[PDB]
């Protein structure tokens, strides 16, 4: 889990957007330091459904 995050951290453009299920939104942002589309708080249902 950490190994993938570290790989993204240094091997991808800083402005890259990563798509994943909402479960992992917090972990990716904290360690990968890359933008995410969905997050655990799930404040927008329509965004998650899309």
């Amino acid at each position: 889990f950490r190994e993938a995050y570290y790989w993204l951290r240094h091997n991808t453009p800083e402005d890259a957007k990563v798509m994943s299920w909402w479960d992992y939104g917090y972990q990716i942002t904290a360690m990968a330091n890359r933008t995410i589309l969905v997050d655990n708080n799930t404040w927008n249902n329509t965004h998650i459904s899309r």
Binding site: R2, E3, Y5, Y6, W7, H10, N11, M31
Partner: protein
Amino acid sequence: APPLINEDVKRTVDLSSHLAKVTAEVVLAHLGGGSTSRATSFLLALEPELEARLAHLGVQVKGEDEEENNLEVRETKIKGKSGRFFTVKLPVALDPGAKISVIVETVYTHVLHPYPTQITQSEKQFVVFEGNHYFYSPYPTKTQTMRVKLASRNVESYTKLGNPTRSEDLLDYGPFRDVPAYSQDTFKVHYENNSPFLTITSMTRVIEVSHWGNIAVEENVDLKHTGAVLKGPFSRYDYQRQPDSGISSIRSFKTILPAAAQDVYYRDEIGNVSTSHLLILDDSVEMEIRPRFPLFGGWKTHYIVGYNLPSYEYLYNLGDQYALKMRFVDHVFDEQVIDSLTVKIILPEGAKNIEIDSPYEISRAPDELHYTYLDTFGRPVIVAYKKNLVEQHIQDIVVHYTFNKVLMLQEPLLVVAAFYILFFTVIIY
């Protein structure tokens, strides 16, 4: 000035790895007659193309006493002539009609360029090297030869000036004769090179010495793979299944730590790393470090390693005077290249008369003041910088300072007061 000539030159060029080592054995001779003064020193010249990339230069006389045969070399500028020059002081003056044999060693960095720039997982790695056929010197050379050692025998192309013989992975050039001084001919070779192209972009070395019998060192390492850039997707399945896959890729490297190193820890910004294997040899503590993911061209990683050492191994004292000897930098790996190294030494608070006997030139920044556990006055910090360091620069440095015994007893007193005041507050309440 006395007229000197290069009676014989033999050049060996090593291109096996990402660094180009050059050794030239020159039998210097004095051409001047009795009227000319005895020559105590001789000049060395750098080609303009490679002068920027010269990591290190060493000269030693050809003799059994190699330890004592090393000659002092100083950077000098000769008027009217472009390029860097070095002045070498001979052990004994060279009188007219005499000759001496000296060995010159130079190391250049970044001189091998991947061609093609981009390769896929299956494709191999090829590099281009550009040198000189002739020994570039202020003095004429009577005759010279070159021997070039390639990383692999699969040499794609090379310059055939002088009908060089090619056997196995070795090339022979010359013998050239009557070469004028300052002569240049561009030697170009393109060949397969699969050696690990690892560059340490920056490293920070922090040394903390504590009066309680312990010194702790932590090194922050930033590593980048400077080989041909990977092209196309990375197949995990292919990489595991086939040995040949990603042959250029680097899997692991080994660091030779100090013999006394204790409590060695390997970690990263995001937590610990459990892949490193530690082996304790009698002479040194071998550490095998494996990065979290294999490094292909253009990839990078960061890691931090630290360890503790006993005081008596490296610390020395004479009453109030304390002098500590430390190796300047760790042996991270063979053929290591460091673009920027910063060394910080944190002495105990209250140190006075701090002096540093640098082995060689290093920029020194103003000393900082550091606060850590129990510090009120503050611990003095020594700061230094250098660039383009290579393996040859693993020398020894000594620092001298004065300290007093009473200061150690100060440490308990501060701690006791905080507890006592709490009792007093209860009484008042």
